[PDB]
Design a protein around this ligand. Structure first.
Ligand SMILES: CC/C=C\C/C=C\C/C=C\C/C=C\CCCCC(=O)OC[C@H](CO[C@@H]1O[C@H](CO[C@H]2O[C@H](CO)[C@H](O)[C@H](O)[C@H]2O)[C@H](O)[C@H](O)[C@H]1O)OC(=O)CCCC/C=C\C/C=C\C/C=C\C/C=C\CC
Ligand SMILES: CC/C=C\C/C=C\C/C=C\C/C=C\CCCCC(=O)OC[C@H](CO[C@@H]1O[C@H](CO[C@H]2O[C@H](CO)[C@H](O)[C@H](O)[C@H]2O)[C@H](O)[C@H](O)[C@H]1O)OC(=O)CCCC/C=C\C/C=C\C/C=C\C/C=C\CC
Ligand code: CLA
Ligand code: CLA
Ligand SMILES: CC(=O)O[C@H]1CC(C)(C)C(=C=C/C(C)=C/C=C/C=C/C=C(C)/C=C2C=C(/C=C/[C@@]34O[C@]3(C)C[C@@H](O)CC4(C)C)C(=O)O/2)[C@](C)(O)C1
Ligand SMILES: CC(=O)O[C@H]1CC(C)(C)C(=C=C/C(C)=C/C=C/C=C/C=C(C)/C=C2C=C(/C=C/[C@@]34O[C@]3(C)C[C@@H](O)CC4(C)C)C(=O)O/2)[C@](C)(O)C1
Ligand SMILES: CC(=O)O[C@H]1CC(C)(C)C(=C=C/C(C)=C/C=C/C=C/C=C(C)/C=C2C=C(/C=C/[C@@]34O[C@]3(C)C[C@@H](O)CC4(C)C)C(=O)O/2)[C@](C)(O)C1
Ligand SMILES: CC(=O)O[C@H]1CC(C)(C)C(=C=C/C(C)=C/C=C/C=C/C=C(C)/C=C2C=C(/C=C/[C@@]34O[C@]3(C)C[C@@H](O)CC4(C)C)C(=O)O/2)[C@](C)(O)C1
Ligand SMILES: CC(=O)O[C@H]1CC(C)(C)C(=C=C/C(C)=C/C=C/C=C/C=C(C)/C=C2C=C(/C=C/[C@@]34O[C@]3(C)C[C@@H](O)CC4(C)C)C(=O)O/2)[C@](C)(O)C1
Ligand SMILES: CC(=O)O[C@H]1CC(C)(C)C(=C=C/C(C)=C/C=C/C=C/C=C(C)/C=C2C=C(/C=C/[C@@]34O[C@]3(C)C[C@@H](O)CC4(C)C)C(=O)O/2)[C@](C)(O)C1
Ligand SMILES: CC(=O)O[C@H]1CC(C)(C)C(=C=C/C(C)=C/C=C/C=C/C=C(C)/C=C2C=C(/C=C/[C@@]34O[C@]3(C)C[C@@H](O)CC4(C)C)C(=O)O/2)[C@](C)(O)C1
Ligand SMILES: CC(=O)O[C@H]1CC(C)(C)C(=C=C/C(C)=C/C=C/C=C/C=C(C)/C=C2C=C(/C=C/[C@@]34O[C@]3(C)C[C@@H](O)CC4(C)C)C(=O)O/2)[C@](C)(O)C1
Ligand SMILES: [Cl-]
Ligand SMILES: [K+]
Ligand SMILES: [K+]
Lengths: 149, 149
């Protein structure tokens, strides 16, 4: 469908970024700029969003990540093909959850002002142009998701 | 049902342990005794198990956690009523996933030999009596879950 088509485009444009991330780093376990109770507010919104998702879409998303784990290289990076299946599944998951519950997650993360520190720190460890191209691609992808909603 | 009743008992018996854990600690973000790709391999088993759960059971589990998040005290401990609903929902989730996929998660974590370091460390920060009461209650609870499969 159109989400599937958009997933192909998103995946191919954002794969360079995905390959550059250090998947072995322990940094992702903690958000140092927030206390745990602040992080839990965003976790709450993601739990609410997930509970709003179609079971069929969630199960497809789970299977796609299971396969993706199976195809990782020595650096932890799954294949483009399995990345595309992940993005297609997540697109269908987000579609089923609806806009308000998805925006509630953004809004909860906005309370961390990640653009000041975490965002630029993460970008500094990858190719900036590749990160920008992934974001441009995400902005197009989200339009197909919203069209489905 | 039988899982509901077993959850009421398990929750009351394990609430002392639950209250004693330091929910504000960052220690849970990392497992120091395994590489991240070894942890990912155990996460694979949990993804598979979650994909096997009935969709409505999983949904009920998420709604129970959302409610629990709204009742946490200053130390992060949810109310016993909400903990009980969590355990009843998780019990139905596990029952729907089945025994083999649940044991596959156990066996993955058994690879980490947690009883040699992590288990003792976690138990040292709480009351060992209450941790053991929680574990014995868990062994009774799992009998009702298995009986439902
Ligand atoms: C499985 C789910 C797990 C976690 C969910 C996490 C993240 C996804 C959820 C939400 C999105 C995240 C943040 C958005 C919120 C606020 C905006 C912001 O921040 O904005 C900052 C920045 C983006 O900046 C934006 O950047 C763009 C740049 O694009 C512009 O400029 C471009 C040029 O580059 C182009 O011209 C383009 O056309 C134009 O629009 C604009 O300037 C926007 O105005 C500006 O806001 O985002 C950033 O920093 C991105 C930082 C993301 C870091 C990742 C994770 C955070 C840490 C922990 C997660 C928490 C818990 C763990 C989970 C579970 C526990 C076990
Ligand atoms: C949402 C899900 C998230 C994470 C999943 C985590 C946990 C759930 C999954 C599996 C269960 C975990 C471990 C079990 C595996 C092997 C057994 C073991 O290890 O055994 C050791 C010990 C218990 O030992 C057992 O203890 C009992 C004690 O029983 C005796 O003593 C009792 C006294 O209470 C009774 O009298 C009883 O009758 C008597 O037999 C026996 O001695 C057994 O022989 C002995 O094996 O357990 C321990 O230490 C257990 C330590 C638990 C530590 C917690 C987490 C693990 C670490 C990281 C999480 C990873 C990733 C997070 C995910 C995502 C990131 C975003
Ligand atoms: C198996 C392990 C595993 C791992 C390591 C991850 C890791 C991640 N997941 Mg996935 N997830 C998994 C399993 C996993 N997930 C499973 C089993 C499910 C259920 C089926 C999901 C469902 C899920 C959802 C629904 C979402 C995630 C998202 C994310 C990312 C959140 C942080 C972020 O935005 O970074 C940066 C993101 C990436 C590196 C991913 C690829 C690039 C994207 C598409 C564009 C990035 C644009 C820009 C550069 C950064 C974002 C800024 C902007 C949003 C403000 C992170 C890379 C979230 C995400 O990516 O939000 C954007 C998200 O929405 N995951
Ligand atoms: C909102 C945030 C949040 C937080 C912080 C947690 C945190 C936890 N979850 Mg929950 N989870 C959540 C949301 C959350 N979850 C959501 C939204 C879902 C989906 C609906 C789940 C679904 C889920 C499942 C399916 C399971 C967990 C489990 C766990 C625990 C894993 C580590 C462990 O065993 O510690 C120790 C455990 C506790 C402190 C829990 C209470 C006491 C238990 C019942 C007995 C403990 C016995 C013994 C002392 C220790 C374990 C020994 C082992 C051999 C069994 C941990 C306490 C796992 C777990 O507890 O396995 C044992 C588990 O099986 N969670
Ligand atoms: C049981 C089970 O399996 O659950 C499964 C549940 C899911 C949801 C399916 C699942 C998943 C997805 C998950 C969790 C995604 C998580 C994404 C987290 C991203 C975190 C990021 C980017 C964190 C940081 C931290 C940073 C810190 C930077 C700094 O501190 C540094 C260094 C130095 C300081 O001086 C300055 C600083 C700038 C402050 C940073 O820059 O970024 C998974 C894994 O499958 C597990
Ligand atoms: C039942 C149960 O337990 O379910 C489990 C199910 C899972 C899946 C395993 C699970 C999980 C993970 C989940 C849900 C993750 C969710 C992630 C959500 C990410 C949301 C994002 C990125 C949203 C946005 C919104 C944006 C908006 C941007 C703009 O609008 C802004 C501001 C202004 C406009 O002018 C321009 C704009 C640019 C348009 C944006 O940029 O990004 C969990 C938690 O474990 C629960
Ligand atoms: C440790 C380790 O090795 O881990 C390995 C684990 C794996 C899994 C094997 C692996 C991998 C692959 C990974 C992580 C892929 C991640 C993909 C993430 C995709 C996320 C997507 C698409 C999210 C969204 C959010 C959306 C929101 C859209 C909206 O809100 C927006 C904006 C604005 C609203 O107005 C309308 C809206 C429509 C509501 C959307 O449309 O899409 C890897 C790389 O190998 C690493
Ligand atoms: C108990 C235990 O051990 O659990 C283990 C479990 C695991 C799964 C094995 C595990 C793990 C792995 C995990 C979660 C990995 C998650 C990775 C997430 C990476 C996120 C990245 C890169 C985020 C960003 C955001 C960026 C933003 C860039 C921009 O916004 C910037 C700045 C400015 C804009 O103008 C342009 C822009 C381009 C938009 C960027 O460039 O990058 C871990 C940690 O080992 C713990
Ligand atoms: C996007 C999103 O929201 O995803 C949601 C996805 C879910 C699944 C729904 C979700 C959830 C649940 C999760 C992840 C549960 C995770 C549990 C993790 C438990 C980890 C433990 C016990 C870790 C450790 C580490 C230890 C270290 C011990 C030692 O090093 C110490 C200190 C010092 C030395 O002495 C040596 C040592 C002894 C070795 C230890 O002793 O224990 C959540 C939160 O809702 C988020
Ligand atoms: C589709 C989708 O969205 O899925 C998502 C859904 C979620 C839920 C959000 C999600 C998640 C988290 C998941 C699945 C967590 C799973 C946890 C599993 C825990 C399992 C446990 C404790 C199992 C066991 C087994 C044991 C056995 C013990 C014994 O047998 C032993 C050895 C020997 C006998 O002589 C005695 C015995 C005492 C009998 C034990 O002691 O413990 C994920 C990953 O995000 C995917
Ligand atoms: C950071 C922070 O503040 O977080 C806050 C977040 C919250 C959510 C609000 C909060 C809370 C509450 C929490 C964490 C509750 C956690 C509960 C976990 C319960 C887990 C259960 C029941 C797991 C299982 C596994 C089972 C497996 C059973 C079997 O395998 C067994 C053995 C043997 C096989 O032969 C048969 C089998 C039958 C297959 C089972 O039967 O059950 C708190 C405390 O407030 C903290
Ligand atoms: C990006 C970011 O910031 O994400 C943040 C997201 C969150 C959600 C806010 C977050 C968090 C909170 C999390 C996951 C909390 C998880 C807590 C887990 C606690 C586990 C405990 C206590 C485990 C145990 C196991 C024990 C074992 C005991 C025994 O086996 C022992 C030894 C010996 C046997 O004979 C008897 C026994 C009795 C059986 C014990 O006694 O205790 C965090 C970390 O802030 C990160
Ligand atoms: Cl509400
Ligand atoms: K592709
Ligand atoms: K003690």
């Amino acid at each position: 469908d159109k989400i599937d088509d958009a997933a192909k485009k998103l995946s191919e444009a954002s794969y360079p970024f995905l390959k550059e991330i250090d998947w072995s780093s322990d940094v992702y376990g903690k958000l140092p700029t927030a206390n745990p109770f602040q992080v839990l507010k965003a976790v709450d919104k993601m739990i609410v969003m997930g509970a709003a998702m179609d079971s069929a879409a969630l199960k497809a998303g789970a299977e796609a990540h299971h396969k993706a784990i199976g195809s990782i290289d020595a650096k932890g990076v799954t294949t483009l093909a399995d990345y595309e299946a992940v993005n297609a599944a997540i697109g269908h998951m987000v579609a089923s959850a609806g806009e308000s519950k998805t925006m509630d997650v953004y809004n909860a993360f906005a309370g961390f002002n990640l653009g000041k520190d975490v965002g630029p720190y993460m970008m500094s460890k990858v190719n900036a142009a590749d990160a920008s191209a992934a974001y441009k691609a995400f902005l197009e992808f989200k339009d197909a998701v919203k069209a489905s909603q």
